């Protein structure tokens, strides 16, 4: 149950940021991030911000958190 | 071509496997 | 229970008496290794990184006359002084100091702390106050120097740029 | 003069490992100096860089390399063999001081052999 | 290769330093 | 390595009765380990390998959009 609860609450917090992220990014994106796709949950946009190195950067600190905080916490 | 960064990213993930391997080894 | 990470339990083998204690050990390396070794390793890695951070800061508006005409970038410098045969003299001298300061007991199996807390290598010629919060001041400067040094060399590898030039007005 | 016992044990008695009066460190130091000095020879003259400019440097560094392995070997032996600790050589503290003597001696002995061959090349 | 220096550090490490450390560690482990 | 470590922690050590559940292990290993692996692998051949064989790049970047057959499902 402790595992499943950790997973549910983790999914809850990731999903909530992601749903608000989509809505916020739809309303307006930053200029220097030249977002060609207006569809936020498209492969086209995902692929762009992997190549920009934006999702590469947040992957690093998410992976950092999960290994140094999330895994000890679990 | 595989960049210096890609080779070093591989090494940190191999380090993580090292950590988790030692954890398993120590318990077994 | 851990002051630094209250959601995690306190690392048992750590203690508040140890200098720079926040109870910060999420990986629990203090369970895997003897604290006295880790403590000694921390302060040493610090003291070495401290000198390394100064080395880069001084050899930038200077480079000692008699060694003039050498690149101040990390990897080119390393390659130059190894070819010169200066780094091999430094290696043996550091090797000498390591054996002298630890008095023979250099191994993780051998190194002991009879009448010396970790870090106390018996080097205080000026005789400044030691047994106080001065150990925490060494640790904080050492910890900052270790991250500092890491920030210098990675900046030196990224865009081949000087430590002091980076903090002017530059983005990639 | 018996030869088998008298000259044998008489000589052996005066060797640094056996000689009365010496601290473990000075026994080590003397043993080191003797070994470091001669050990450079094979590496200098028969090593892979013997016909290069690095002939002597390569010879010295190799000798220091070997001496480090020997000293680590010494330290491991002492740690395993001596759970008890005392001032005598056959003890944890004494064996570590002997090892310290040997390493200093052998690096210095190697260095001294390198200095003489450069002095009288 | 890109990081053509790495074999100069890792082959000695895996080939000399780590085997000596492992032999040393196992020696103490099986003799205590 | 995490799974290995987890399953020798007291709460995650499976019971002897679990290990001797023959019928369950066979169902799962047949339908899941062999069956679904072969089904999923078919997916790879149809979506990635066969396209690659015909000079059509299908990868993680585009596989959602690029149908492996014109007629679809
Ligand atoms: C480089 C070597 C190094 C070593 C050997 C140590 C060792 C120690 N640290 Mg220190 N620390 C360091 C660097 C180091 N630290 C740096 C650079 C910082 C600044 C962030 C800190 C900040 C810090 C705090 C706030 C605290 C410690 C504490 C400790 C002690 C327990 C934690 C532990 O897990 O030990 C062993 C740790 C290691 C071997 C580090 C391994 C690092 C991995 C392999 C790579 C990480 C890269 C990044 C992503 C131990 C003596 C705790 C203590 O009780 O001090 C008395 C404590 O509260 N450290
Ligand atoms: C410990 C203190 C410390 C300080 C004060 C800095 C300060 C800085 N870092 Mg550094 N950095 C550090 C540690 C530190 N770093 C460490 C431990 C690493 C991991 C090795 C890095 C890896 C890093 C990278 C990859 C980059 C910086 C960059 C920078 C600059 C930010 C410019 C910017 O993006 O806006 C700034 C001068 C950026 C820079 O120099 O501009 C191009 C940059 O690209 N840092
Ligand atoms: C097995 C190979 C070997 C090799 C290649 C050498 C080579 C050397 N020895 Mg060594 N030596 C050896 C074994 C070896 N030794 C052994 C087993 C001992 C007994 C412990 C010694 C004891 C010894 C002493 C006491 C001295 C040397 C010295 C020398 C050097 C100069 C000799 C010379 O002028 O001839 C040139 C080469 C040839 C003719 C070939 C030379 C580098 C001398 C030295 O280092 O001078 C400063 C010196 O004083 N050796
Ligand atoms: C077993 C016999 C044998 C011998 C004599 C040699 C000899 C040599 N090898 Mg080879 N080698 C061998 C087997 C051998 N090898 C094997 C089985 C392999 C595995 C494939 C190799 C692989 C190999 C490589 C990869 C290399 C060599 C190299 C060498 C040279 C330098 C080695 C060196 O510096 O030694 C160091 C020697 C010592 C530290 C001491 C030797 C023993 C001393 C002299 C004994 C003295 C005892 C004394 C008389 C007692 C007196 C006591 C009291 C009365 C005072 C030398 C010509 C190197 C070379 O460059 O070739 C030209 C090199 O790079 N060898
Ligand atoms: C991955 C495993 C590995 C690696 C990287 C090496 C590397 C080397 N071996 Mg080989 N060797 C190995 C396994 C390995 N060995 C095994 C398993 C055997 C048994 C079959 C051998 C048998 C062998 C022989 C017989 C010889 C070599 C030699 C060499 C050197 C030849 C290059 C040269 O010209 O240097 C020339 C020498 C130098 C540039 C001086 C450097 C010597 C060391 C690195 C001194 C470092 C001192 C330092 C302060 C303290 C660290 C010591 C130690 C803990 C590393 C090179 C260092 C030759 C050699 O010269 O060795 C001394 C040689 O004669 N090897
Ligand atoms: C869907 C459910 C499922 C799945 C996927 C698995 C999977 C696995 N379980 Mg099982 N297990 C399950 C349910 C499942 N289990 C249930 C319900 C129970 C309790 C009733 C168990 C009880 C159990 C125990 C006690 C053990 C396992 C073990 C295993 C592992 C076996 C080793 C292996 O990796 O084989 C891989 C197998 C295949 C890929 C199948 C095909 C292999 C054949 C030979 C086909 C030939 C190859 C083919 C042509 C491909 C070529 C590839 C390429 C090179 C070209 C595997 C990961 C073992 C283990 O290792 O745990 C860590 C183990 O000890 N399981
Ligand atoms: C037995 C089943 C199987 C096997 C062995 C492979 C093997 C491979 N696939 Mg294929 N693939 C499969 C089924 C399989 N696939 C299925 C069912 C589909 C959907 C139709 C695909 C669609 C697909 C695409 C689009 C691509 C691949 C690619 C690859 C190659 C690299 C994969 C990689 O980096 O992951 C490393 C291994 C893992 C991460 C293993 C753990 C599996 C995790 C836990 C499950 C998650 C699956 C996946 C990684 C992420 C899902 C993405 C999501 C949007 C659905 C490798 C040859 C890539 C390639 O480069 O092609 C040449 C590539 O771009 N595959
Ligand atoms: C990342 C990077 C940055 C780097 C800055 C980073 C954070 C700073 C890290 C450096 C540290 C703090 C140096 C540590 C100081 C060390 C000094 C050299 C100590 C002197 C000697 C003492 C006092 C003790 C010895 C003695 C003791 C035993 C006591 C007595 O016996 C007397 C003596 C004998 C002196 C920027 C900001 C530049 C920007 C750039 O873009 C990228
Ligand atoms: C606390 C701990 C954590 C760890 C925290 C993390 C940030 C610690 C990482 C430490 C790093 C950054 C040390 C790096 C610096 C240390 C060394 C010793 C620097 C010596 C360099 C010199 C000696 C080179 C001479 C050079 C000179 C000067 C000039 C050049 O030209 C040539 C060269 C040759 C390069 C966690 C998160 C893992 C969890 C765990 O549970 C608890
Ligand atoms: C971070 C960084 C760095 C570093 C890094 C490195 C150096 C790395 C390393 C790495 C490594 C070094 C890794 C390792 C690994 C390991 C592993 C991964 C292992 C494995 C194992 C296993 C898997 C198993 C085993 C076993 C056995 C055999 C016995 C007992 C049991 C068991 C099963 C456990 C540098 C400097 C670049 C800089 C930048 C940053
Ligand atoms: C042939 C013969 C023989 C043989 C021989 C032999 C065996 C010899 C050997 C010899 C030897 C083997 C020698 C050696 C020597 C050595 C030396 C002489 C050294 C010294 C050193 C020094 C001088 C210094 C040091 C140092 C330094 C430099 C630095 C710091 C540290 C120290 C202090 C340590 C016999 C007799 C049997 C018989 C007859 C014939």
Short mmCIF file of C-alpha atoms in Angstrom, two decimals, chain A residues 11-60:
data_model
loop_
_atom_site.label_atom_id
_atom_site.label_comp_id
_atom_site.label_asym_id
_atom_site.label_seq_id
_atom_site.Cartn_x
_atom_site.Cartn_y
_atom_site.Cartn_z
CA UNK A 11 1.28 10.61 -10.56
CA UNK A 12 -1.24 13.14 -8.99
CA UNK A 13 1.49 15.86 -8.64
CA UNK A 14 3.13 15.18 -12.09
CA UNK A 15 -0.34 15.09 -13.82
CA UNK A 16 -1.60 18.30 -12.06
CA UNK A 17 1.52 20.33 -13.16
CA UNK A 18 1.21 18.77 -16.70
CA UNK A 19 -2.57 19.62 -17.11
CA UNK A 20 -1.91 23.25 -15.90
CA UNK A 21 1.30 23.29 -18.07
CA UNK A 22 -0.73 22.46 -21.26
CA UNK A 23 -3.38 25.19 -20.46
CA UNK A 24 -0.66 27.79 -19.52
CA UNK A 25 1.49 26.95 -22.63
CA UNK A 26 -1.69 27.14 -24.86
CA UNK A 27 -2.59 30.68 -23.55
CA UNK A 28 1.03 31.93 -24.10
CA UNK A 29 4.63 30.61 -24.57
CA UNK A 30 7.98 32.50 -24.09
CA UNK A 31 9.49 34.28 -27.18
CA UNK A 32 13.10 32.85 -27.08
CA UNK A 33 11.48 29.33 -27.03
CA UNK A 34 10.40 29.51 -30.75
CA UNK A 35 7.42 27.06 -30.36
CA UNK A 36 6.37 26.16 -33.97
CA UNK A 37 3.58 23.72 -32.80
CA UNK A 38 0.53 25.17 -30.90
CA UNK A 39 -0.39 21.53 -29.90
CA UNK A 40 1.42 20.98 -26.52
CA UNK A 41 0.83 17.14 -26.34
CA UNK A 42 2.00 16.59 -29.99
CA UNK A 43 5.15 14.57 -30.88
CA UNK A 44 6.20 17.68 -32.95
CA UNK A 45 6.48 19.97 -29.83
CA UNK A 46 7.90 17.23 -27.49
CA UNK A 47 10.63 16.47 -30.14
CA UNK A 48 11.50 20.24 -30.49
CA UNK A 49 12.10 20.77 -26.69
CA UNK A 50 14.18 17.51 -26.55
CA UNK A 51 16.40 19.00 -29.37
CA UNK A 52 16.39 22.53 -27.73
CA UNK A 53 17.77 20.78 -24.57
CA UNK A 54 14.90 22.16 -22.39
CA UNK A 55 13.41 18.67 -21.59
CA UNK A 56 17.08 17.38 -21.40
CA UNK A 57 17.69 19.93 -18.54
CA UNK A 58 14.47 19.18 -16.52
CA UNK A 59 15.14 15.39 -17.07
CA UNK A 60 18.56 15.91 -15.32
#
